[PDB]
Amino acid sequence: IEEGKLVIWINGDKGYNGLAEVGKKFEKDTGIKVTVEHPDKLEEKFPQVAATGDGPDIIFWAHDRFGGYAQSGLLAEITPAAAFQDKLYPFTWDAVRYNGKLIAYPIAVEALSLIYNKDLLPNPPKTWEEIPALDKELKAKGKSALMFNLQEPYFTWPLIAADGGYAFKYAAGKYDIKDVGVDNAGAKAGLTFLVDLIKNKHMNADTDYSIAEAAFNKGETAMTINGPWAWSNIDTSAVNYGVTVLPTFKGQPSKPFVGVLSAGINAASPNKELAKEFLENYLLTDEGLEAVNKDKPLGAVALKSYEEELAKDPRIAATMENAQKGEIMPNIPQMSAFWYAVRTAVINAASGRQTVDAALAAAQTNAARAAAQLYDVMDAVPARRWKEFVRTLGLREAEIEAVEVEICRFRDQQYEMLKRWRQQQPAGLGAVYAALERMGLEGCAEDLR
Amino acid sequence: KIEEGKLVIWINGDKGYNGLAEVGKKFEKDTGIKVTVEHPDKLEEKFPQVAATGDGPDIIFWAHDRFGGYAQSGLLAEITPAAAFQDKLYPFTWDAVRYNGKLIAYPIAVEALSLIYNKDLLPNPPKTWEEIPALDKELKAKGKSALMFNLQEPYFTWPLIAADGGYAFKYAAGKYDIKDVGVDNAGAKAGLTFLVDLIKNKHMNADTDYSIAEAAFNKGETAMTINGPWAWSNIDTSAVNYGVTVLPTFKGQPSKPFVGVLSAGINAASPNKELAKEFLENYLLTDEGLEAVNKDKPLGAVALKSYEEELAKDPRIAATMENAQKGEIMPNIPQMSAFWYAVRTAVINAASGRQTVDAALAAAQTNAARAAAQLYDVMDAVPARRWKEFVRTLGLREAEIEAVEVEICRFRDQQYEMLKRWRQQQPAGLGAVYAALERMGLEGCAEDLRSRL
Amino acid sequence: IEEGKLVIWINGDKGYNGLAEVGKKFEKDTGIKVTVEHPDKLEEKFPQVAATGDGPDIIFWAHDRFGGYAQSGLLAEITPAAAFQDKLYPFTWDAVRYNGKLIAYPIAVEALSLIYNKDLLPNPPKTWEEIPALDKELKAKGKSALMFNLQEPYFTWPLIAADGGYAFKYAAGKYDIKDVGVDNAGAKAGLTFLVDLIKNKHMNADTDYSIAEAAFNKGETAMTINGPWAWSNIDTSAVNYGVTVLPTFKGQPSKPFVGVLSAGINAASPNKELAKEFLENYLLTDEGLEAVNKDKPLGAVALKSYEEELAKDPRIAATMENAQKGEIMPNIPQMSAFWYAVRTAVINAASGRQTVDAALAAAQTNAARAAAQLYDVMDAVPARRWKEFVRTLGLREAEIEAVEVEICRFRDQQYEMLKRWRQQQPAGLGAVYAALERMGLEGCAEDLRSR
Amino acid sequence: EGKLVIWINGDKGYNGLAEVGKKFEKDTGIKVTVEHPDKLEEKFPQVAATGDGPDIIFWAHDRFGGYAQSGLLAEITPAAAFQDKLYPFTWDAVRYNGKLIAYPIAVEALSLIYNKDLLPNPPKTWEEIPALDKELKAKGKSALMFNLQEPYFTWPLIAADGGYAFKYAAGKYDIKDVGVDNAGAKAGLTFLVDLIKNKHMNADTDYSIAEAAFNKGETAMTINGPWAWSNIDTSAVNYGVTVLPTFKGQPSKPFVGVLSAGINAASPNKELAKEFLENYLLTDEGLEAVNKDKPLGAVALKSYEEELAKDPRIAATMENAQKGEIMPNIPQMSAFWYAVRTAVINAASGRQTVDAALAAAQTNAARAAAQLYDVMDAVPARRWKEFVRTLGLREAEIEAVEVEICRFRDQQYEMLKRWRQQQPAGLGAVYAALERMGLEGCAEDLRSRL
């Protein structure tokens, strides 16, 4: 990493030119030219390059991968003055905190909202409980009240959590993995309500993101649940739409997972003090965050001064309202196990293969079981290259032999090698995907993404 | 349930079952409390299942190592012997009958390996392992060998591996730290190097097993073997004139054979527990009572000091006790299975050249605390078509079975997860696996899985 | 085998005592001792003992299993005089023929019939199509119209074949294995009717032999489909019963498979002619077939004279009527693959697993594939005793090592050893079942024997 | 119609063939297009299964038997007078079920390569090599190093005393008559293992190790074909090519490969092809026009081989070819190579005794299943059904397996097994299918083992 200058990695779908323009304003006042790059799969290239002391100085990504970055220590700890922290919304700072330490700066905020067709419905329902009655009056007229993706628990979670569902308990400065909240009464109530919507033919268990978007963009349904990323396809659509707060359930607010785009600093960067100046004094300001907003919009921002001017749009105000009422998505690696156990729980409850209590009881157990993902890795790798793969991952030759001397069957050996390998090296540092690209198996990598 | 006002006792048939009936029959003359001594088959295995039902005998006699599993599910009553009575038994015997701070049984007999030497070929057996290579070359001039013993099961090689610092699990405060295993330390590392060097220097052959060594010693072809008091019977009918003595030292330190203590535990579901404690202490465990059992079939070395002093006059029994006091009590925890697995593989690979001594013991140290290899063995002992009937019979509850099925795709992967999870709702060993196979009419599969333990 | 003596194996559920007496009057007139014994699981121990030139002189079993015995050459060819063959019904002789030569004597005839509760139903339906209306009228009274085993295709086949279904075509003197008829329109129509009966809740896809037997004998349903073997359990039952012709479908008779109890004689027997005298002149007569019938009934018999006197019983007359309307079950070894392909098709069609045309399309391709049966063996024997198993089967050590050296993965090795073993030995000679019992794994044999 | 499109691989004189093919143009008018696409070997049967592809195909004779049994090459009918213009054994290489399938052009076989400076007189028999080897390992050298990983290089010795792959009787290869377990093969491979036991060769030597050692003067002899000659030319070593040593008095018998020109069975210009091949290609000028673009080695045509048999290396190649065997063009040779490769490597390493290795190779020589289990483990299990669809296995055939077969690996083999006789080996379907899945890696790594 070149001394005395700033290199920044931000994803190609963001206003990388606008950030370059904030950076050359930083060049005039210092002499520090910043070069903004938007590599592909930077999220996965960064922990690899950074682990050997290379890579960019600053990276922009969703806060949720920073928990893994910080767990192997690849991000510098920031300690901004309390006066600076007060300029941003407090819950955004919770999103970039890991073992008590702040690891990045919050930039932008995103959450799901209720999107309603103003023509088909000028006054959207404020409660989930109104929607069944609303739906019969409108399917008399060939329209339905609501369609949204029921295949990812990301879209179904706001309802399951409204009455008391939650992923992992966060008490002081840590997420208690021993405390899962998929089997509590509130979660059973939320998922029972969604399953009843399907049993009462108010929604179809097969609805996915494309079906639901299609229905809403061809005016076939009055409401959908989607994020600010979907606003553009409905803008090109002929539909006239509004964005507002998610409906309530049992009087309680729906709680969507919140994602915060964040700027972390390379723990191996020699320009750490220069990185903090660009973010604190040039980027995280109203003029700087607007130079990036106008290249490609950020939506709701973590900095209060600039959001209050962006809440001009009731759509952006709704995103923030739903964000303040929801959870920050946890940045810990076991969130993978959580998603797979829950997604399976919703699909089985919605299809009838499991009852609500059985689906959520199984998801309670499986949310803390990482085995299902190693079997997936095993069957994503051609069996003929299992031990080449396990070495390329960096499992030591001594542990490979310890498995081979005691474990007979071949499939059992690779599971033992993988299970042991994961305990020696925490997720997620792009190790598996880098190993597969270093074996000439990028297909396996892409298919595993 | 069990019968109050009567004592029922289970002891294995290879023990002095009649002699115990008679001390119990003299115990009735003074009370009227009839003893019924029974010697069922697979008693070790029937008791924890039967006892889990508030059933079984009142007192159980078995090797101490299996009372730790019994005691972990609370199937044995805590004993409260008088402090004066505890002084009547050798102190280390009491260490064998601990589980998590409480005493669970009375020690009766003590067993360990000894050095057995042919007096004609060798009137004065070597006192150190380091003498044996020189002893063997001088003696291969006459077509014989100095020493052969079983090199296949680590039970017979462990006394050398542990002499200089080897150990199974560290035992500190009445508990075995199962994450503190000691087969990769310098003493083990030295002990096994000496053993494989004996093989490299063609003083022993890596393939020698129990029958080859027993035959060779009993046919006068070798001067020394390592075996326990059970083998003495084949040596007596044999023409060989033999001596029994203390194992040789290694690097100045004693060889440490594993010690087994035959023990009497009391059923936690027995209502006549207090009546039971009197029979063992006051009638059985004295010179008079255990002499009645010794005479039906011998006990070897016994835990009670007074009577061993009459049995130690036989230098063979004195050697067993000497080797016992210098050895290591076999831990009563179930993870001893994983230990036996890993160490068996290490010794075999080090003796054959697959691993150097450091690699074999490093691998065995890692694998010594991992139970997975034993569940893959269970999976392959049951026909795959009856896998899900099997784990149900084991008592894995129907909800966790479903939790596995909905998340795990491949079937072999499912069965491992169900067994692995079942292993965590229920500790070994109460014969859950053997009762399950043998209630499914698959006694055969049980034996074939029972053969390896 | 003792020369100058006849030893015969008949199954223990048949009139072995009455057959002993046919043999003992054979003794008054002969000097030749005959001994009737009824070993258990005889069907599988006979080819084992017989393969070494031992075993009984005559064996009684269902004709379908003589095709395997006869393909390994374990049964002597009969050539009875044409005058004798005309005493038996001709289709019975087709059941004991294999590659043009006759391998056994026909004895008894067996087929499914419609069994109806005359109290709940004085006039049973003559057509399948009446049954949905009959079931609606009758479930008003908490009762069911018809329940029979839908797990095993033996009971479902009469309907699938009525309109044109058929197992393997029989043209000259053999069954054309490239010509299976489970994917034709008639088979689709019969199974479509069965699946519709379930969709319209006139039957449940889960009814099995024991559930259906209980339901009819506890008066809960008015009709079942079962064979003469089930008649005694309803006799002790309180149910008043009738036996009659199976219903028609699309105007055509339903066609049940016919089983012929048969007496073949050991190809290694030195008393072949003496065995033929006992069967031709003493057993297959009115007196001989009554001596065993009266110990335990045979049902319908292949001998015309004695059937005409047993057909007084309308129950036995019905069995013969349906047998003649049905098709002889083929005695060829591919019938294992066919039954297994067809079994899954019915169960999947009846449960919704597959659509009717997909289930029958799969059964069409899979009907000639025996691979599925070796994989069942693999998962019926515990993996740690696999090589003991294949050795006990007699697959030889060069053959085991040849597989191990070239095939990497364990199950791939297990399939390769069996595949090579099966090409050295045709099914079915009880090889797998004997091997598992010699390993002390009768349990595994028990449960693999269940299929 | 009205055109000839011709496929030859790039390691041959494809321009020189254009040069004679354009002279076939001047006198006829039927444009010939000479192309050298990659993976020609497997791109041809895919197009030809669609009635498409080149008019002429050039490749080694061994795979035309697979082409011809799926009926993708036209039967050629050369004049009896034309047939003598080629060496008689060449025609045996391009005959299939009595029918001739292609015209022979060039013939290739392994020879003994000896470094003349380190050894002026190479040993003429194998039994001399242990003694010759001791004198030279006194000087840090070895007598002989050659690839002991591929049975192609080990076979000449194994066959000297009576070994043989498949017996060729009438116009057919008898698949139940394999000769890798006879006394001659046991004697040849026992001699090979004894050379290894007596540390005269190392069981792990491979093609690059052996090539490097001989070209850096490290060893006095190697066994290799005419393809390796230029790397020895660029090497500073000056070498000689001669007849393989004898073993127990009989000649070493290397496999013979014949480069051949077949005619597409779906080509409408069949007569035009035979006019170009017989009258323009297979001539002294025509086979020379390609030879100096890139040398062919030994050629099947009688007059022109005498014209480069002047080169003692090519004369040695032909001598050894005449002493060896036409490699069978039948598909069961895949199973044969795999069974024999396992035998040699296990015999050389000690895993098996010589008779046990050869007994297994005897049984396994006609068994193709080992190749399908490799396919199963070359594709990630999670993409099996995408793979199997890309192969063209029909959806009814897939469901029929899943409906009947319980366990996952068993389903995969049953799908491949059923697929293989609906489409016989070998048409490169597996390798083409993997490349359309974004799995070039898996494809390459599975094509590395063949």
Curated annotation (Swiss-Prot), chain B:
Cellular compartments annotated: Periplasm
A cellular component term, taken from the record's GO annotations: ATP-binding cassette (ABC) transporter complex, substrate-binding subunit-containing
GO biological process: carbohydrate transport; cell chemotaxis; detection of maltose stimulus; DNA damage response; maltodextrin transmembrane transport; maltose transport
SUPFAM superfamilies noted in UniProt: Periplasmic binding protein-like II
GO MF annotation terms: carbohydrate transmembrane transporter activity; maltose binding
Induction, as annotated: Induced by maltose and the transcriptional regulator MalT. Permanently repressed by cold shock in a PNPase-dependent fashion.
InterPro entries: Maltose/Cyclodextrin-bd (IPR006060), SBP (IPR006059), SBP_1_CS (IPR006061)
UniProt entry keywords in alphabetical sequence: Periplasm, Signal, Sugar transport, Transport
Quaternary structure and interacting proteins, as annotated: The complex is composed of two ATP-binding proteins (MalK), two transmembrane proteins (MalG and MalF) and a solute-binding protein (MalE).
Family membership noted in the UniProt record: Belongs to the bacterial solute-binding protein 1 family.
Function: Part of the ABC transporter complex MalEFGK involved in maltose/maltodextrin import. Binds maltose and higher maltodextrins such as maltotriose.
Identification of the protein by name: Maltose/maltodextrin-binding periplasmic protein
Originating species: Escherichia coli (strain K12)
Swiss-Prot record, chain C:
Induction of expression: Induced by maltose and the transcriptional regulator MalT. Permanently repressed by cold shock in a PNPase-dependent fashion.
A GO molecular-function descriptor: carbohydrate transmembrane transporter activity
Pfam families in the cross-refs: SBP_bac_1
Domain of life: Bacteria
GO cellular component, one term: membrane
Location of this chain's protein in the cell: Periplasm
Keywords noted in UniProt: Periplasm, Signal, Sugar transport, Transport
Biological process, per Gene Ontology: carbohydrate transport; cell chemotaxis; detection of maltose stimulus; DNA damage response; maltodextrin transmembrane transport; maltose transport
Predominant localisation class: periplasm
Subunit structure, interactors included: The complex is composed of two ATP-binding proteins (MalK), two transmembrane proteins (MalG and MalF) and a solute-binding protein (MalE).
Function: Part of the ABC transporter complex MalEFGK involved in maltose/maltodextrin import. Binds maltose and higher maltodextrins such as maltotriose.
Protein family membership: Belongs to the bacterial solute-binding protein 1 family.
Name of protein: Maltose/maltodextrin-binding periplasmic protein
Organism: Escherichia coli (strain K12)
